Amino acid sequence: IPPQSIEAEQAVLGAVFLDPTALTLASERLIPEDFYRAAHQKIFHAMLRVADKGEPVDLVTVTAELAALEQLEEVGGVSYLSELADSVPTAANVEYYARIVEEKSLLRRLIRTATSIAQDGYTREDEIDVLLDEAERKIMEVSQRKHSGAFKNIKDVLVQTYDNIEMLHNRNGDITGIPTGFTELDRMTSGFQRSDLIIVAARPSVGKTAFALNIAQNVATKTNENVAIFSLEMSAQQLVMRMLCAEGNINAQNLRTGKLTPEDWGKLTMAMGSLSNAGIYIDDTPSIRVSDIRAKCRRLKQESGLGMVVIDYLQLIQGSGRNRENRQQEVSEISRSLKALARELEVPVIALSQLSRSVEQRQDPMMSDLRESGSIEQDADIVAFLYRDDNKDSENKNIIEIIIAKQRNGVQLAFIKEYNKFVN
Template sequence: MLELPNRQMPHSTDAEQAILGAMLLDEKVCEDVKLKLQPDDFYHHRHRIIYETMLILLDQNIGVDVTTVTAYLQDHKRIAEIGGVEYILTIYESVATTAHTEHYVEIVLEKSISRLIINRAQSLIEQGYDPETSTQDLIDTAEQQFSGLARLNQGSDFKQIDNVIIDFIKNVERLSQSTGEVTGLTTGFTALDNMTSGLQNNDLIIVAARPAMGKTAFALNIAQNVAKLNHVNVAIFSLEMGADQLVSRLVSAEGRIEAHRLKTGNLEGADWRSLKIATDVLSNLGIYIDDTPGIRVGELRAKCRQLHQQKGLGLVMIDYLQLLSGSKANGGNRQQEVSEISRMLKEMARELKIPVIALSQLSRQVENREDKRPMMSDLRESGSIEQDADIVTFLYREDYYKKDPELNDNIVEVIFAKHRSGAVGTVKLAFRKEISRFENLVNVPESAHIPDV
């Protein structure tokens, strides 16, 4: 353990002695303490040895008292390390009651976390002086080292079912007062909302497709609709396109302006009016765009946490997962890196209590099958993604593969291959590629040639 010059690490000798003394005095205390403290939480070496001995005795169903602890330490020739039998007696005799043991446990745990923070901070300082350590690596290390510390102070105890049921009933009553079937964030797509009841908090949602299926347009439309219809802030991380290209797609979809006209500036009279209306609408939405290429997942999470704290955050969309970078701790193993990325995205969804949408690539093996509809096995580095995701959807356009002039086009199948809290199946939407816009089938104009379904 690191000690700073002329300064002792935070600790409480009295609290540590009081806990050990209470365990020697009353065996009933032992199980409660065992659930909350580890040997390393004790600052003093001899206290760690005594506590480790008590845990061993408990595991062997041997009662914990002065006699059994002393005998074990003597048998294993460790009695001298803790100051002899006299020290065990001193601890035992210093405790008159076990009434305040829980408070002493909180003190010891708090001091232990303080020491952990100091040690990790000192380690970061040492890395900072290393000329071979980049600033980004330092930031990633800090994110990993400190992101979970808050949870150490909030142990998750058993929840008695009657208390959980009370909260459950309150939630059902709240949902019953809402109109319609949508209990999460509405996407603006009726069939999609019927399948999911809206985008739910804590969910990691994967949208995967082969190129040209429209997955980026689909996710952008959802992000745009969520911001507009639910009045929440949305963060978009665009690792493939710059912010200007992404905004061009948003304007095209919102104003129903053909993308090539925006790209060339060849707008007609009605287009200018549509451009003005679309930009006015988008300017008033809480959409935040980050187009940092190759952003590390730790940095992404830190940015989302900051936005959530400062302005509030309702949804995160990432285009796309395979372009994210993990930490260097994976030693160049891409599969481990993707596992880390998907795990951290799921943790972020739970921490911020928001849905997170991540786009994903599919492997080329789709093209080798007669039926081109994607399957779970087509996900790139699929194992961890499939495990961490709450929803996995695939996009499929039959007209892309079947060059048949008789085949009505513009239909996209949204295939729910995994749905942790609901049904799997397929819903259909219209895709107007020229304006980067998905629409409900019933709302598509006749010129789009959408068949009756």
């Protein structure tokens, strides 16, 4: 039996009776002759016909078009159109359905055209050059059928480009999300908004660990939302040593060393004070499963009050899925639940996609870089990259740059090596 998909096919028509916008998209991919069941042929034919006449797409009108043709009792009456309206899963995916229809339609041709070649292979056995030629032509003809040609004209890109730069300059406003004590970003972010799968990525030198912490951190001090930190690589207290140095302005080296002064003891004794009243919730578990990240984020919201979730680099999360080298897919499965999680707890799941191997080895950022990491870019409502380069003159620091490469509806920080912090 020829490739076909009634189940998909009938799902398409139904999509149209569930919402006219359906037809528009549909007509983009198929043509009446693409459907397999004759009935569906006429019914589509009918439909696009009425949509042309100005008549909006709907049950009645087509019933009309159809009847008009002497085709109703043919395609099974409205009764089936009723059914039709029922046959779809959800119009919002009407594209796919149609595609699937298109494919089963195209393969038909790869087969019919081919089969016809074989029949001719045996018949005209009296001029083969010709035979070969059209055998080439024909086949190519099969490929050039998928209603392709989606060239994004330059006019559409520019308008988009200029509209992006205007919002850029119009972005003077009042935060409506979790305030990020970083005026520059803050002016961009407009507040780390809730339900947003937040991803920030970069190269080694741990430059990232510091930035997330410092966020969750400055977030725990000022905002009154509770924050969660998933530093798999970094331990409970290891992390806290990093923010204690940061909030108190202590030379942690001076501290790890225990080489602390009496004023340093202060700053030290002081940083703690800050967090005491803070709301920081860590978890340094070796490597957990997305299934657990959920149980603990979700449970807290219901217990105390969830606001942020900073997981220290996703790559190191264990994927319950199927093993042995399908990380492209593995990450695809977990990074996708995170996006599903930015939704449930109505909070921003900021994640830091970082690296070691490929980024460090590329010694001598943008989208294609994390795309290698795969489909995180799609789930993410916001993707940001950290970029910093490596005078002998003092007043020692290093200006790091924030290059946010994406944001659904949408910087620079100086870094401090002595306390591993960040300043505006």
